[PDB]
Design a protein around this ligand. Structure first.
Ligand SMILES: [K+]
Ligand SMILES: [K+]
Ligand SMILES: [K+]
Ligand SMILES: [Mg+2]
Ligand SMILES: [Mg+2]
Ligand SMILES: [Mg+2]
Ligand SMILES: [Mg+2]
Ligand SMILES: [Mg+2]
Ligand SMILES: [Mg+2]
Ligand SMILES: [Mg+2]
Ligand SMILES: [Mg+2]
Ligand SMILES: [Mg+2]
Ligand SMILES: [Mg+2]
Ligand SMILES: [Mg+2]
Ligand SMILES: [Mg+2]
Ligand SMILES: [Mg+2]
Ligand SMILES: [Mg+2]
Ligand SMILES: [Mg+2]
Ligand SMILES: [Mg+2]
Ligand SMILES: [Mg+2]
Ligand SMILES: [Mg+2]
Ligand SMILES: [Mg+2]
Ligand SMILES: [Mg+2]
Ligand SMILES: [Mg+2]
Ligand SMILES: [Mg+2]
Ligand SMILES: [Mg+2]
Ligand SMILES: [Mg+2]
Ligand SMILES: [Mg+2]
Ligand SMILES: [Mg+2]
Ligand SMILES: [Mg+2]
Ligand SMILES: [Mg+2]
Ligand SMILES: [Mg+2]
Ligand SMILES: [Mg+2]
Ligand SMILES: [Mg+2]
Ligand SMILES: [Mg+2]
Ligand SMILES: [Mg+2]
Ligand SMILES: [Mg+2]
Ligand SMILES: [Mg+2]
Ligand SMILES: [Mg+2]
Ligand SMILES: [Mg+2]
Ligand SMILES: [Mg+2]
Ligand SMILES: [Mg+2]
Ligand SMILES: [Mg+2]
Lengths: 63, 129, 386
RNA sequence: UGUACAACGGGGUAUUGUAAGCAGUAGAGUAGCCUUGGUUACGAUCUGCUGAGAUUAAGCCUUUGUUGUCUGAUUUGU
RNA sequence: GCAGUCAAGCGUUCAUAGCGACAUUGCUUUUUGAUUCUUCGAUGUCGGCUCUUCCUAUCAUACCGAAGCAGAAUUCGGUAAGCGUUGGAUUGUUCACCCACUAAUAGGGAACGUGAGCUGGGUUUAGACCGUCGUGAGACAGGUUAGUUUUACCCUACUGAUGAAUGUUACCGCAAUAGUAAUUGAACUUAGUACGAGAGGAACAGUUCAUUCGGAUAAUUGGUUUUUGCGGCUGUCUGAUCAGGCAUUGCCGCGAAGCUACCAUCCGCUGGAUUAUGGCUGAACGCCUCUAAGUCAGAAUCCAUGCUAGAACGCGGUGAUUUC
RNA sequence: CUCUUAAGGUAGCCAAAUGCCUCGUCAUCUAAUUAGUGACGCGCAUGAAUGGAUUAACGAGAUUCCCACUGUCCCUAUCUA
RNA sequence: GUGAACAGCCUCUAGUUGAUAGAAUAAUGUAGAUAAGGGAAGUCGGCAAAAUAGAUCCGUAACUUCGGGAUAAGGAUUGGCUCUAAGGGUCGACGAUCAACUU
RNA sequence: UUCAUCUAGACAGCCGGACGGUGGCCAUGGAAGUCGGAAUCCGCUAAGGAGUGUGUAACAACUCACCGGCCGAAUGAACUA
């Protein structure tokens, strides 16, 4: 099995977990859970959401 | 010829017309191959042949019943590989009773199940799922 | 006048009455047909439903759209520690059915099974089987005489086995005792097998094998008193309905001037005995085997227990049977797994499944990590520890 | 009178989303003072300690810890 | 309304493949009549919704016989009611009509089933308008608009749930009886094959799915939020801060657990006896004959296997049975 | 031309809350309309202060369609008191 | 206090804390709510519910009795904080001083 | 019940013949026993219809009435209830 990445949070997605959203421009978004799916639908910025991998990378957290 | 897909388009649903036939929406009046249950609306899924009318669009396509093929669903369904997925909207393409499209091009993505079911839709399609 | 529109009736009339099962352990009402040329073996096993997880496997089904492709399947885990044989029962056939002729018990019975004979164990004198144990005084003459009667009679032989519930995380502490038919003929050597296995454990791997289709017999989850709408699936009455709408509008015609048995009525839902068949065993996992949840493709040294433990159950430390799909009964409930009563050759059975990955993420939420090591690798160092 | 049970506590798990407090050459600036390159008052907010803090069985899992509990009543005979 | 008997004719020839005149014999009580036996100290009066069951005069599905059956399709008929028989526009409608899917969209009964089950659109109180009629008050199976749908806690029936008595108590069982369930379609292949001049065009076996139904289940996805769990926001109050109260759950986002969805997943058995029918042997009736004696195969049928309950007055095995 | 009246329904309007036949006919609206609207009028039985026709605005009046919206429904599920 | 407001919500003075209670949390109810995808396909009928909603700016059709229709329709913005500008009184083109909100 | 056949050989059964005038006369496009109208003869016969059916465009070719070969004792038909 291949592990996917949450398009919003960067969390690792295992088979059957989360949802997949095909946008009108055919771009694929994978969400590990309904929390990340709902934040994406609310158009929150992962760079502003303090627990996302993108946020931690932009704020140099962990490195 | 297709695994069951969670029905998301009952009779009365209006989907966007994703082809270039000149129709802008398709209004579900029937679903081909649908069963019968008291009070149960016949409901369509991705890849299903339906009977539809054109509510808005080019006038010679309106006011008549025509076959259509559902190419996008927007109702979450489960694939056998465990993925729950859905499109941004509901979309279909006008076709003849033998599955050949009235138009010549698809706008937007197309479900893999629909492309596998209808080679004409797959041939006219762009991005698949 | 006629119904004016046809519809199938709501519910199955063959599962009546929708009453509470007489016991929490559902009875095995039919054992596999005896093949008397085979070795002596158990026809069923007792386990406890631990919980469900999900697996990934390559589908081997030629002609299918998913042939040689990965499929995600739900599976149920039944914790199955070895069961202890403590007795043998002989059954003679009579013009009035099968009839137990005599039961021969083991000399020593553990407190686990002795608790089953006591409503108030803590304040009892624990006298159970104390005079029976004296039947084994010097040569066991009475025991051998009863076994000889079972051999001379009792065309059907069943062993008495009890669960090792102390090996489960359950607080019950009182073992479940059940009769399992011995298939594999020569009633003589059926009795010999039972006697030689007296006081000894039988592992689930000696009864069940990988890919085998089995049946689960269990009492379903109880839901108390239920209305017709959910108990039977009847149509909800319109919003305008006076005196409630979660009802059946017409419970009967004027004649017969009686409510008929076939009309849906409000009553108990769940806690029924169910025998569901054709569940394929995906794993026969061993308790002592670390990397229980690992496969030949995963190789992550992890047990079958989800992170944080099976919700409302605990950890699997014993042998377990992983069956495809779901089985009746809820977690912590005793379930009897029995061999199929017929030979299935539909290419759904006879399929050899090879697991590629077993989900061990937490079921206590939206689990993100399979192992604490993976959680550490993803998250890095935290303030508390790690 | 125990691989006992319970109440807390610890750990795991999970939820949320970065606690209070302190500090800052952060901060759109406004208004005072002089060693006119600083300082004083107010300032949404920002940054660091801080994926922190809070909650977590009430029908989650687990427990080398702390504390405690363990003979009250009634009835039953071939 | 439905079904027979005759058989002049239709069916290019040919009564009876399918029909069938002139006649004639019936059946049914889902039509409408006829009557006025029951009910006027009151059986709630249309239709629809919901739900169960029953009938067969069978629309579909199973197996068949016949054809003006080459194939495909269809028509007639038999066993058959096991199983299903729909979604909508208009109408209060029953009825009707059309759109559409489907294997089919069969007909009916159960106080023209079903109002202390609903609803009240209609009819059928009182208000009001119109048309015609009437001098008028008023009349109108003429049209239109508005118009309170009450009570169960009793008995039985049904659904579930306890329970005395059998020496006591506990465990493991048996199974009389009762119920019972699966259903249908598509695609691939057989096979562009059989068949057919051609056009067209199957079937058996094998495979993958699906429809309808049913029994479970919550790993996943979704829903639900008093976890009032976390965070945020408004107004006010606690002097400010921290931390909170109130706003009848203040509102918003996320939200674990539980519950739950063809909105999620899993599972839904194989043996015998048979019906129609097609046969064997074989007389009756030196022949013939599936039938008379005997006998073979055979249906979605029946009975079993299997599944549910376990007789609370059916039964068995087994443990312990009160030092006072 | 007749018969015939006090006058023989004029201007208007209509299958209209007035038309039996009738679900009238044509068109439009819909996939489909005994609904709605616009027309037609030998109009059972329309019609002029028993007021005719039309009307901006107004209406807890009756009706049709469209957008939005939603558990009315598909098909139910869950929570609180 | 918020707010246009005698609206709704919170509070001060004053008053009350009075409704038979306790334990559980089945069905069906009464009242309040949510709901994936579809969106009236339900139904006699959108019944019920939902959607909209305040204020500022833009823009507003047919028709009309010219008065309306009209908030037609249809759009954008709205918090907090720090500032800026304009709009005054009194006293003797300005000076001094004082003062409150609205944009 | 009635009428028939039968040791001078009945019924059934199996096998053989089933001819000649002659494609009898007539529309018909064709019609030879067999689409039809009328005509129902003669011969040789143990016996054979100007034909009982199948069949052909017409023929042809099969088949049956009728008579024979085998067998050997009863049989057939229409009715009645
Ligand atoms: K009466
Ligand atoms: K949940
Ligand atoms: K507050
Ligand atoms: Mg309906
Ligand atoms: Mg019916
Ligand atoms: Mg009501
Ligand atoms: Mg979980
Ligand atoms: Mg009465
Ligand atoms: Mg009554
Ligand atoms: Mg019949
Ligand atoms: Mg009635
Ligand atoms: Mg009634
Ligand atoms: Mg009533
Ligand atoms: Mg009624
Ligand atoms: Mg009414
Ligand atoms: Mg009235
Ligand atoms: Mg008058
Ligand atoms: Mg009347
Ligand atoms: Mg269910
Ligand atoms: Mg969720
Ligand atoms: Mg809430
Ligand atoms: Mg207060
Ligand atoms: Mg609060
Ligand atoms: Mg024969
Ligand atoms: Mg017989
Ligand atoms: Mg009993
Ligand atoms: Mg006129
Ligand atoms: Mg008129
Ligand atoms: Mg009109
Ligand atoms: Mg309409
Ligand atoms: Mg008038
Ligand atoms: Mg008024
Ligand atoms: Mg103010
Ligand atoms: Mg919704
Ligand atoms: Mg939605
Ligand atoms: Mg919409
Ligand atoms: Mg409707
Ligand atoms: Mg309807
Ligand atoms: Mg209607
Ligand atoms: Mg309303
Ligand atoms: Mg506006
Ligand atoms: Mg207007
Ligand atoms: Mg001829």
């Amino acid at each position: 099995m291949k592990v996917e990445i949450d398009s919003f949070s960067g969390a690792k997605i295992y088979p059957g977990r989360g949802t997949l959203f095909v946008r009108g421009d055919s771009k694929i978004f994978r969400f590990q859970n309904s929390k990340s799916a709902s934040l994406f639908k609310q158009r929150k910025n992962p760079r502003r959401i303090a627990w996302t991998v993108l946020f931690r990378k932009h704020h140099k957290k962990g490195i | 010829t297709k695994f069951r897909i969670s029905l998301g388009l009952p009779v009365g649903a209006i989907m966007n017309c994703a082809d270039n036939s000149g129709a802008r929406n398709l209004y579900i009046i029937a679903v081909k191959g649908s069963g019968s249950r008291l009070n149960r609306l016949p409901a369509a899924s991705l890849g299903d042949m339906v009977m539809a009318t054109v509510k808005k669009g080019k006038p010679e396509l309106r006011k008549k019943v025509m076959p259509a093929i559902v190419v996008r669903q927007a109702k979450s369904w489960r694939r056998r590989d465990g993925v729950f997925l859905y499109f941004e909207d509901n979309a279909g393409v006008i076709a003849n009773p033998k599955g050949e499209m009235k138009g010549s091009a698809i706008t937007g993505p197309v479900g893999k199940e629909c492309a596998d079911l209808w080679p004409r839709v797959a041939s006219n399609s762009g991005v698949v799922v | 006048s006629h119904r004016k529109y046809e519809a199938p009736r709501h519910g199955h009339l063959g599962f009546l009455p929708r009453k509470r099962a007489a016991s929490i352990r559902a009875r095995v009402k039919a054992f596999p047909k005896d093949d008397r040329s085979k070795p002596v073996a158990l026809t069923s096993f007792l386990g406890y439903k631990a919980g469900m997880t999900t697996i990934v496997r390559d589908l081997d089904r030629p002609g299918s759209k998913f042939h040689k492709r990965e499929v995600v399947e739900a599976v149920t885990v039944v914790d199955t520690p070895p069961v202890v044989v403590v007795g043998v029962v002989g059954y003679v056939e009579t013009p009035r059915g099968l009839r137990s002729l005599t039961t021969v018990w083991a000399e020593h019975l553990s407190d686990e099974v002795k608790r089953r004979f006591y409503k108030n164990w803590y304040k009892s004198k624990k006298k159970a089987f104390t005079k029976y144990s004296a039947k084994y005084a010097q040569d066991g003459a009475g025991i051998e005489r009863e076994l000889a009667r079972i051999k001379k009679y009792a065309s059907v032989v069943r062993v008495l086995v009890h669960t090792q519930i102390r090996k489960t995380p359950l607080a019950q502490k009182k073992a479940h005792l059940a009769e399992i038919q011995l298939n594999g003929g020569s009633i003589s050597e059926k009795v010999d097998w039972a006697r030689e296995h007296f006081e000894k454990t039988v592992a689930v791997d000696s009864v069940f094998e990988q890919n085998e289709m089995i049946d689960a017999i269990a009492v379903t989850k109880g839901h108390g008193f239920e209305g017709v709408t959910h108990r039977w699936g009847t149509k909800k009455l319109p919003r305008k309905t006076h005196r409630g709408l979660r009802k059946v509008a017409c419970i009967g015609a004027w004649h017969p001037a009686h409510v008929m048995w076939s009309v849906a009525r409000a009553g108990q839902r769940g806690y029924h005995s169910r025998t569901s068949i054709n569940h394929k065993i995906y794993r026969v996992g061993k308790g002592d085997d670390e990397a229980n949840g690992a496969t030949s493709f995963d190789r992550t040294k992890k047990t079958i227990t989800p992170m944080g433990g099976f919700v409302h159950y605990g950890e699997i430390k014993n042998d377990f049977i992983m069956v495809k799909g779901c089985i009746p009964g809820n977690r912590k409930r005793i379930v009897t797994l029995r061999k199929s009563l017929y030979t299935n050759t539909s290419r759904k059975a006879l399929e050899e499944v090879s697991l590629k990955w077993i989900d061990t993420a937490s079921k206590f939420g939206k689990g993100r990590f399979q192992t604490p090591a993976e959680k550490h690798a993803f998250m890095g160092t935290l303030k508390k520890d790690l």
